[PDB]
Amino acid sequence: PNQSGNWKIIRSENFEELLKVLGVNVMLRKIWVAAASKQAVEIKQEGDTFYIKVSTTVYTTEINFKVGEEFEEQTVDGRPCKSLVKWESENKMVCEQKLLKGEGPKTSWTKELTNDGELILTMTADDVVCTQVFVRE
Ligand SMILES: *C/C=C(C)/C=C/C=C(C)/C=C/C1=C(C)CCCC1(C)C
């Protein structure tokens, strides 16, 4: 059941708390928290192959992966990492991340398309879980 589409954010929970764990400067946190409620997300899914574009005025990223194959992306705070996505269930994928260089909080993300048509993203750093909920444009 396919996640392709243009998605608009409706709620963002614990994003500032996540940025705190990641050590992001407070003045930057305020800007990023504001931008998080205005983001645009585009997904192109063909089976296990994904393209994801996340766009805001301060931050934009493009993610490319196939489920089950290691790939490179960045942590939320911008550090290059090695990632691997697996299906946890029919509708929900989970990504484990490992920094290329250095140490820091354990980070991961999940993405799920629900029965009622919401896309739910979670992003985790150590004990803090941020949840962002999207609906189709
Ligand atoms: C599967 C969906 C993924 C992996 C989405 C990742 C989205 C981000 C890493 C978003 C990051 C943002 C910032 C770093 C600051 C501006 C607000 C966000 C939420 C767009």
At 63, give phi and psi (nearest 5°): -120, 135
Residue 11 corresponds to which tokens in the numbers above?
């709620």
62 vs 73: CA distance, rounded Å: 9
Asked if 56 contacts 39 with a C-beta cutoff of 8 angstroms, the reply is yes
Question: How many Å apart are CA 115 and CA 118, to the nearest integer?
Answer: 8
Q: Interior CA angle at 97 toward 94 and 103, to 5°? A: 150
Q: How far is the CA of 26 from the centre of ligand 1 (A)?
A: 17
Task: List the domain range (segments joined by +) for residue 114.
Answer: 1-137
User: Nearest 5°: CA angle at 15, between 13 and 21?
Assistant: 130
CA distances from 127 to 17, 22, 53, 118, 130 (A): 10, 11, 26, 25, 10
Domain of 32, CATH number, reads 2.40.128.20
* Solved using: X-ray
Q: Is the Cβ atom of 85 under 6 angstroms away from ligand 1?
A: no
71 Cβ closer than 6 Å to some ligand 1 atom = no
CA 114 to chain centre: 16
Distance from residue 76's CA to the centre of ligand 1 (Å): 6
Total number of domains in the chain: 1
Ligand 1 neighbourhood includes 94 CB (under 6 angstroms): no
